[PDB]
Amino acid sequence: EVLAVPLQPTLQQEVILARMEQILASRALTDDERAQLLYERGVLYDSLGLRALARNDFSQALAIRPDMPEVFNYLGIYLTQAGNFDAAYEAFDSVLELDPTYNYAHLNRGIALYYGGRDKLAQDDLLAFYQDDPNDPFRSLWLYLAEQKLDEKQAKEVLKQHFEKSDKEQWGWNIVEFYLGNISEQTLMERLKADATDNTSLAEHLSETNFYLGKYYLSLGDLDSATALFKLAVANNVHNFVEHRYALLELSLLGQDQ
Amino acid sequence: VLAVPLQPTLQQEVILARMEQILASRALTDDERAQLLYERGVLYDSLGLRALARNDFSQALAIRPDMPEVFNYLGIYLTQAGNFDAAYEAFDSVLELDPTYNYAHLNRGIALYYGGRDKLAQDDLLAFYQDDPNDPFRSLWLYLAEQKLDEKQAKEVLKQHFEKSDKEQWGWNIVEFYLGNISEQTLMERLKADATDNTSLAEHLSETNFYLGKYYLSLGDLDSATALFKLAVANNVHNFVEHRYALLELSLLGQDQ
Amino acid sequence: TRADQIPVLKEETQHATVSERVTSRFTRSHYRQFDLDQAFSAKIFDRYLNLLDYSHNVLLASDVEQFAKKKTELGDELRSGKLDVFYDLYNLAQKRRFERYQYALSVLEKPMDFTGNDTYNLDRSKAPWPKNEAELNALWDSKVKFDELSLKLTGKTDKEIRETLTRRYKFAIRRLAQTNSEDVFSLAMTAFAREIDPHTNYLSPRNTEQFNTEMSLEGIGAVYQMDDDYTVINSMVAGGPAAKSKAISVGDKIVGVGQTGKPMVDVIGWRLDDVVALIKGPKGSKVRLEILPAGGTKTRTVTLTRERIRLEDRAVKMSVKTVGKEKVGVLDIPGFYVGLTDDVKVQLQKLEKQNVSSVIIDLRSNGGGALTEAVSLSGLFIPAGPIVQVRDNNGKVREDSDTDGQVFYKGPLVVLVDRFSAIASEIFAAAMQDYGRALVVGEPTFGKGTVQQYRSLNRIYDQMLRPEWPALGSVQYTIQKFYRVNGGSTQRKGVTPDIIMPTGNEETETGEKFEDNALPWDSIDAATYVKSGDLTAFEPELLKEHNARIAKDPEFQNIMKDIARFNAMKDKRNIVSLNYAVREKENNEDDATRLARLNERFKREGKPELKKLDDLPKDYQEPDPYLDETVNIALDLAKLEK
Amino acid sequence: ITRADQIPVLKEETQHATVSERVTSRFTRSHYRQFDLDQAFSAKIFDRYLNLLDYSHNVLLASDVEQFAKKKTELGDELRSGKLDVFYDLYNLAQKRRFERYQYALSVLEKPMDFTGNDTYNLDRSKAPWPKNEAELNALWDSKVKFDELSLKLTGKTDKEIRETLTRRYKFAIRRLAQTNSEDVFSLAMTAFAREIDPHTNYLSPRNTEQFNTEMSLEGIGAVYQMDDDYTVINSMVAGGPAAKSKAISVGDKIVGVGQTGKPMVDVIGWRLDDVVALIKGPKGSKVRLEILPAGKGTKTRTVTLTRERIRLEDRAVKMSVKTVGKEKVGVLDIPGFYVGLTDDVKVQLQKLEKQNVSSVIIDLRSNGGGALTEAVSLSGLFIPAGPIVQVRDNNGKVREDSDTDGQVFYKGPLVVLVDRFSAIASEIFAAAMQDYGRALVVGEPTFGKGTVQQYRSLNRIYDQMLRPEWPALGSVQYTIQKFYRVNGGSTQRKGVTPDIIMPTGNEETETGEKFEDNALPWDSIDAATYVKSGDLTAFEPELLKEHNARIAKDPEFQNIMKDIARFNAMKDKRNIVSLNYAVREKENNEDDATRLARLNERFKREGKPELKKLDDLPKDYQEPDPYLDETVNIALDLAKLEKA
Ligand SMILES: [Ca+2]
Ligand SMILES: [Ca+2]
């Protein structure tokens, strides 16, 4: 019942794309500048859900300059979405070898191990990722999701500790409070509307929230409520949220059981 | 009833990357360059990248200014922006360059409709209806314009179009809902029955929720209309007239707030 | 030219397209939502005849009937671009006119007899069409006699009158054969344009003639239109030399253009471009203009030095009227130029230094200007709120607001307006009334509550697909309509003053409400605004003190007995006598009155009296009793606010 | 000329740090087996590294294992961070303790040899307690040099020859020990990690200039060689290789000597593999001869002479033939391997089998190491209308079914599948499917049980050599990604296919098979697929089995092979324990030869063939008969008789 207008490409995204084409076609770029700008267009293509175009730019960046951690991160994300967890692990390991401070590679490798049926090792990554910024509610959420496959009760105790330790300012702690039992689905959605200031903040909240809701119903065995919720997360077109990409993977898994 | 919102296909993204490589060469005649800028504009539009599309369409005109195809898309986009005046000029440019370009009657009709000029919208949409009577969406678009003149004769005419037709095309089911013959639930039951995969599903939903959105809008139920326009646009069949007018309708509800 | 040696005019190949192009824009984009059906084609047909034969004395009823069988079909023809009915009627009556000017040259041999009881109606616009060659000769008997008496009443000999009218009727013959296919197309589109609203127009492409002026090089500050055969002053530019010499008024008609020293050249029934070219020429120089006012004939001359608009001239001017102890600030705003609100703020701070008790904003004869400045200026006197609602050719209503919650003068305010206060001035005055901020004094305003824009009929593929490279024209059509904050339109009503000065309590000649097919007045939903006050309490005591003063005032006494006279003899405003003794007497008596009015004025002022009306200095300034009385109204208001 | 510690103390190259980290990523994350590299698992890794350094528990002292086994549980963390020094400090120590043994062994070659006692030698010292003091270390190499001495004596050598052979062997053992690279220490370190997970997992050192030169001249006798510590072992054989043709060579056979075009047998015991394999890879036509110690018996060594060549296609092809039995007929397809194109060849031959009016068919898949999984499925599908053939599970949990989808049967008459302990992967899938569908009787021995697949992954990364050009090419890992399951939901891991009639060598516990490999993944089940069984032959089993036991009771081939099973099972508790008395060992040698000769001569008298007086006169190309095939033909005919009723 809470719906956003599904996001449309902004005029700035489209102007920048058309400008990135004119510049990449020119000889105004050093090898290093060319590689940086192929990475930046890949991020933009990815922002619009144009993953094959993005991968194409990311691979051209590497061809020019193979020591780019940023690009290895997006390549592993894409191997995760395709279900090739093995290759994905290799790409993120490459990230952290090139730059051991590239924190989001712990996130994304954690997520990939999770979908890969390796929760103990996913907890190693997501625990680390959590330690690097504990007031990010989505780190407590991703850690929780992995730890509930090992031990459902200690997961909820740890999640509850993360919430009580935190300053609880970031909106996402409301999703944690739902996971914990502190609030109802209806209160969650009521706070969702209150905190959204415009259609874009609305869409982002919905993409995030409906994915975590999707996971909740999927753990009770409610495939129809799960499927709807994943679809409605993905219908906000916030391509490039982990929640959008893992909503799509979950729908892919619900498809591949038919 | 929800589809997985459509994602760019691998063929669309391959073609787009190719079109870049080819447009970057100097191998092309002026005519080939203009055709390929139009083809890429259609593809950008097919992915909902309208500003990139408009950019390619304007480049095509600069090179070859006698392209009706481009004029059509430019007027569609002036309609979406609410510049109905400009849009009417663009479609009239289409029909002057090529009086057989039928969809300019559709799109000029629709633009006149949103532009608060239904008598003239009926002239175009009646014409477009005449050019293929078994296209159920021509009876729908005509009906929506005729409803602003007189809701009674609009429904009689709609009902005549349905009874005249062979009734094979799926969209006659949306007409039957408009007429009273079937319920919202039977409509959706036939929608699921007729959809063979997620793409056919999403296209049916983009179409159906828009027409449902218009029905509720006419009863004054702004919340059901708003939801249904949103859910049409969530199928991401950008390039359907229903997707574009779903978004315009949401825009009108917004600029009333 | 003695027979039909006049070229039979042909539509150029381009005109086909251009007709279709203008039917798209008017039928779809025009603010007014009309059907180009059978009824509308009929009305278009009628107005094309009235453009061919304004005075109903060239065509025969049997010539209108020959084409009026298909009058209802002219909608379809304009859509399809079938122009032949327009060309066949303008080639006919190109003939029928030559017939009249031939016949007219013949009647200049006959004797002139100004001793009869006979009459001449100048409005033959709704006349029944002439039946036969006899009534066509009876109406041109009448016409050449009127032309003969007009020149006699300006002291001309039998000799001079016959050679002047010869030169007029033979240059009328020569003019008729100089018209091209762009002239007949231009008039065809005008019949279409003007049936929608009076501000809509087709405009032909400019020739090199505009190219060469810009290439190498400036007239008086006026913009001109065509009353049939008459060059009308449409509007005047704020602080232009036209606007300075307060003799020239909007809607007035020229009959001749003289230069310095050289003779008066008569411009009776000309193409505008040539008339306007006589007036236009580079800096410093002078041109004299013989012109006739709006609604018999009067031999009026105006003389103007040529210029570029000077900024200090179009600037707001401030001054203090004192009345014993009490003082009243006066802001003369000639126009709503970009920067007006800033200049006003400067002068308002000067007005608060001189401890004035009230302020008058004078917007008499202000042709509008920047809608943006109307809003900011409105906003100096209210905290904040909407000033004007704008509705476009699409249904959309926009509100323009003042949003600083500031008041730069909170004291008593009067706005002085007349029948020539237009668009911007109306919006300002309407906002000051609706907010209950100010008393509005003077006459009902113009009532032009709509805006027009231009659009090229050129399309980006024209030069690529055509030989016919001649740039095409533009159209000019109505896109927007202003509405007050109270939801009333300014169309055709404009602002009714709270105290109407005596000339305003009359039918006027000028104003949108008398224009041919002006869009109606209509309402919308009121905006949301907080009224700054209410002056309706005070109106009856302000109105009673006003009538008490203007009863004992020789200026207002003089202006009221000319109104008792002008409305009493309204019966015959168009019917003119053809007796030289009757016309000379009524000319002599106008001059005797005018001289006695001036000499009554000069006796009060201690100024020596004039013996001939011709001895009056050409720069004489008429006094302003409307201002002097509005100062008293302003002081009554400052008193009544206690 | 090494006389004390001149063995250079080896150290890690710069690359090895990274490579340990890279290898630990892939095994800990990508491996089909889901294990924790925690405390318990590092310990087991430590143990297997010791057993790789000192297989026989006769080089290290219990005081030397204890010095490093304080931190055995910590070796997980060390492999992650790439801290290699515990591996290098144990390999540099064991290298000196190995030098200690071979100089002490050279000392014992001067002492007298006395083969007259009641004493024994245990050849499995793998779960033996570590030696306490130098007194255990010299008692164990007293014992070791006496065994080495009796091996050479029992092959007819004089006191003189025996002392000079072992002198070279003990001095080359010392000299080999100082050729070993840091690459050899790292290779074995990773192998301890690899082989603790499962026995098919490996680290593989980069190929050098030498591999490049071999390809430059691009022969291998058709075998793949694995190493069980201190032995060069035949891991697998290629279908229709010269190795596979001369049937005297079976999987798990140990090479202890290599021959030349014309020359003596040079010992390859205790060697590194690349150097052993270099002896074999020679020009086509000019043959090479190899010695063979077979699996699990007191070391009587066979010598085989084989020529070299490339895999000739028609040898790898399916071969068809008709057995007749009075009137009745049985078709036989010898399938050596599952090569691409097999199913097309089979279809051709099945139509020839239709022409010759046979009443049943045998598919022979004895010693077939698998091949193309795709051909297993098509070939399966020739005998069923349509259905799933095999379910495959991956490392990430995904299960996939491979199917036959044409609803066609190209034979449909009675079918037997003949299998043995060397039938692997593809052969198992085919036989398992034919059993589960109730389509065919399975005869012979329990199959190999390798129900998993492995792939290679490079440890090279695209940015190595922009950031570290000093570095050469790096290695690979080899790890298990997939596990086969039947349409019944049973895995082929460790059990493979149990035949419906087990031919006598099959019931008895075997030496070879996945179920005897070190740390083999367990057997497990999944949900059955949905399939329609084409038939049911459980009805016929008892009558088929009783007519089988009746025939093999009266059969001297089967009678002989069952008396060696009563012999091999009776001497089972004491099977590796080998005597050190020359009289008892020469007797056991003489009697094996007497038995073998009397078995051959009993065979020849049946065949009308002239008798052998010495076992050495047997031609080197003698072909053993196939009583397993001849009995399977009767089983196939019993089935046609039972079925047509
Ligand atoms: Ca203000
Ligand atoms: Ca089949």
GROMACS .gro file of N, CA and C in nm, chain C residues 330-388:
model
  177
  845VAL      N    1   0.335   6.200  -0.520
  845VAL     CA    2   0.277   6.161  -0.651
  845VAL      C    3   0.388   6.091  -0.728
  846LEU      N    4   0.367   5.964  -0.763
  846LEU     CA    5   0.459   5.888  -0.850
  846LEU      C    6   0.394   5.875  -0.989
  847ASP      N    7   0.447   5.949  -1.086
  847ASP     CA    8   0.407   5.937  -1.229
  847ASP      C    9   0.487   5.818  -1.280
  848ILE      N   10   0.422   5.704  -1.300
  848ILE     CA   11   0.479   5.585  -1.368
  848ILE      C   12   0.428   5.584  -1.511
  849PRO      N   13   0.513   5.623  -1.608
  849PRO     CA   14   0.480   5.613  -1.751
  849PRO      C   15   0.477   5.468  -1.800
  850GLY      N   16   0.562   5.381  -1.748
  850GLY     CA   17   0.559   5.244  -1.801
  850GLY      C   18   0.619   5.148  -1.703
  851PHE      N   19   0.598   5.018  -1.723
  851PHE     CA   20   0.650   4.915  -1.629
  851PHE      C   21   0.776   4.855  -1.690
  852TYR      N   22   0.882   4.936  -1.686
  852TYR     CA   23   1.016   4.900  -1.734
  852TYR      C   24   1.087   4.813  -1.631
  853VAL      N   25   1.176   4.725  -1.677
  853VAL     CA   26   1.263   4.650  -1.585
  853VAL      C   27   1.339   4.750  -1.497
  854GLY      N   28   1.318   4.748  -1.365
  854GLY     CA   29   1.392   4.830  -1.268
  854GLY      C   30   1.302   4.931  -1.200
  855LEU      N   31   1.175   4.935  -1.242
  855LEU     CA   32   1.076   5.030  -1.187
  855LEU      C   33   1.067   5.014  -1.036
  856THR      N   34   1.061   4.892  -0.983
  856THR     CA   35   1.031   4.864  -0.840
  856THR      C   36   1.143   4.923  -0.755
  857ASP      N   37   1.266   4.918  -0.809
  857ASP     CA   38   1.389   4.967  -0.743
  857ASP      C   39   1.385   5.120  -0.739
  858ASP      N   40   1.357   5.185  -0.852
  858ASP     CA   41   1.338   5.333  -0.861
  858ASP      C   42   1.226   5.380  -0.767
  859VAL      N   43   1.113   5.308  -0.763
  859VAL     CA   44   1.000   5.342  -0.672
  859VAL      C   45   1.046   5.340  -0.527
  860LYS      N   46   1.113   5.233  -0.484
  860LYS     CA   47   1.165   5.219  -0.344
  860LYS      C   48   1.250   5.341  -0.308
  861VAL      N   49   1.336   5.389  -0.400
  861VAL     CA   50   1.427   5.505  -0.378
  861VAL      C   51   1.338   5.626  -0.347
  862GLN      N   52   1.235   5.648  -0.429
  862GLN     CA   53   1.152   5.771  -0.424
  862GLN      C   54   1.058   5.764  -0.303
  863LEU      N   55   1.019   5.643  -0.262
  863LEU     CA   56   0.931   5.623  -0.144
  863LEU      C   57   1.008   5.666  -0.020
  864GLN      N   58   1.140   5.643  -0.015
  864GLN     CA   59   1.221   5.679   0.105
  864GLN      C   60   1.231   5.833   0.110
  865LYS      N   61   1.247   5.898  -0.006
  865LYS     CA   62   1.235   6.046  -0.019
  865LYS      C   63   1.097   6.094   0.026
  866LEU      N   64   0.991   6.022  -0.009
  866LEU     CA   65   0.853   6.061   0.031
  866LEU      C   66   0.836   6.049   0.185
  867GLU      N   67   0.904   5.957   0.253
  867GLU     CA   68   0.887   5.942   0.400
  867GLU      C   69   0.969   6.052   0.470
  868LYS      N   70   1.076   6.103   0.408
  868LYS     CA   71   1.158   6.216   0.461
  868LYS      C   72   1.074   6.345   0.465
  869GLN      N   73   0.986   6.367   0.368
  869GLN     CA   74   0.904   6.491   0.354
  869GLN      C   75   0.770   6.476   0.427
  870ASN      N   76   0.752   6.378   0.516
  870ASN     CA   77   0.632   6.367   0.604
  870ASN      C   78   0.501   6.392   0.526
  871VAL      N   79   0.480   6.322   0.414
  871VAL     CA   80   0.351   6.324   0.337
  871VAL      C   81   0.247   6.244   0.416
  872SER      N   82   0.118   6.272   0.400
  872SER     CA   83   0.005   6.207   0.472
  872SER      C   84  -0.058   6.096   0.386
  873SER      N   85  -0.032   6.098   0.254
  873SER     CA   86  -0.080   5.999   0.154
  873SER      C   87  -0.002   6.008   0.022
  874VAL      N   88  -0.012   5.903  -0.061
  874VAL     CA   89   0.063   5.884  -0.189
  874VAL      C   90  -0.035   5.846  -0.301
  875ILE      N   91  -0.011   5.899  -0.421
  875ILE     CA   92  -0.087   5.867  -0.544
  875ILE      C   93   0.009   5.799  -0.640
  876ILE      N   94  -0.033   5.686  -0.694
  876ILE     CA   95   0.040   5.620  -0.804
  876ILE      C   96  -0.038   5.657  -0.928
  877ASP      N   97   0.023   5.730  -1.020
  877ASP     CA   98  -0.047   5.777  -1.142
  877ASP      C   99  -0.011   5.684  -1.256
  878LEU      N  100  -0.108   5.610  -1.306
  878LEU     CA  101  -0.092   5.514  -1.418
  878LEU      C  102  -0.189   5.549  -1.530
  879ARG      N  103  -0.225   5.676  -1.547
  879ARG     CA  104  -0.302   5.718  -1.667
  879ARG      C  105  -0.213   5.707  -1.790
  880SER      N  106  -0.269   5.639  -1.890
  880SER     CA  107  -0.213   5.614  -2.025
  880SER      C  108  -0.078   5.543  -2.011
  881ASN      N  109  -0.084   5.424  -1.954
  881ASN     CA  110   0.035   5.339  -1.931
  881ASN      C  111   0.007   5.205  -1.998
  882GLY      N  112   0.074   5.178  -2.110
  882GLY     CA  113   0.037   5.070  -2.203
  882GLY      C  114   0.076   4.932  -2.153
  883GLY      N  115   0.088   4.915  -2.020
  883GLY     CA  116   0.151   4.797  -1.957
  883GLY      C  117   0.303   4.795  -1.975
  884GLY      N  118   0.362   4.676  -1.962
  884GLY     CA  119   0.508   4.655  -1.958
  884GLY      C  120   0.538   4.518  -1.900
  885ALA      N  121   0.650   4.502  -1.828
  885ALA     CA  122   0.693   4.373  -1.768
  885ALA      C  123   0.591   4.326  -1.664
  886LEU      N  124   0.518   4.217  -1.689
  886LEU     CA  125   0.427   4.154  -1.588
  886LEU      C  126   0.502   4.134  -1.455
  887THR      N  127   0.633   4.117  -1.461
  887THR     CA  128   0.721   4.087  -1.345
  887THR      C  129   0.727   4.209  -1.252
  888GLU      N  130   0.730   4.327  -1.313
  888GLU     CA  131   0.743   4.457  -1.243
  888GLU      C  132   0.607   4.494  -1.181
  889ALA      N  133   0.496   4.458  -1.247
  889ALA     CA  134   0.360   4.478  -1.195
  889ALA      C  135   0.349   4.410  -1.059
  890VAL      N  136   0.409   4.291  -1.051
  890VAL     CA  137   0.400   4.203  -0.932
  890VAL      C  138   0.490   4.259  -0.823
  891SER      N  139   0.613   4.294  -0.857
  891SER     CA  140   0.704   4.343  -0.752
  891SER      C  141   0.650   4.477  -0.698
  892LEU      N  142   0.602   4.563  -0.788
  892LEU     CA  143   0.553   4.697  -0.750
  892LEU      C  144   0.430   4.677  -0.662
  893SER      N  145   0.337   4.588  -0.702
  893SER     CA  146   0.219   4.554  -0.618
  893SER      C  147   0.271   4.519  -0.480
  894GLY      N  148   0.375   4.436  -0.474
  894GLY     CA  149   0.424   4.378  -0.349
  894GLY      C  150   0.486   4.479  -0.254
  895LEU      N  151   0.513   4.603  -0.298
  895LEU     CA  152   0.577   4.705  -0.210
  895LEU      C  153   0.474   4.750  -0.107
  896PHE      N  154   0.346   4.724  -0.126
  896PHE     CA  155   0.238   4.790  -0.049
  896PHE      C  156   0.160   4.685   0.027
  897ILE      N  157   0.184   4.557  -0.002
  897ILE     CA  158   0.128   4.444   0.078
  897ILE      C  159   0.244   4.367   0.141
  898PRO      N  160   0.224   4.300   0.257
  898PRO     CA  161   0.325   4.209   0.310
  898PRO      C  162   0.367   4.106   0.205
  899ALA      N  163   0.274   4.018   0.166
  899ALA     CA  164   0.299   3.907   0.073
  899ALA      C  165   0.167   3.846   0.031
  900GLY      N  166   0.171   3.769  -0.076
  900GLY     CA  167   0.050   3.706  -0.131
  900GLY      C  168   0.058   3.699  -0.282
  901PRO      N  169  -0.046   3.640  -0.344
  901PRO     CA  170  -0.060   3.639  -0.490
  901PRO      C  171  -0.099   3.779  -0.542
  902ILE      N  172  -0.053   3.812  -0.662
  902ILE     CA  173  -0.083   3.942  -0.727
  902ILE      C  174  -0.172   3.915  -0.848
  903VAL      N  175  -0.140   3.814  -0.928
  903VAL     CA  176  -0.216   3.784  -1.054
  903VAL      C  177  -0.215   3.634  -1.080
   0.00000   0.00000   0.00000
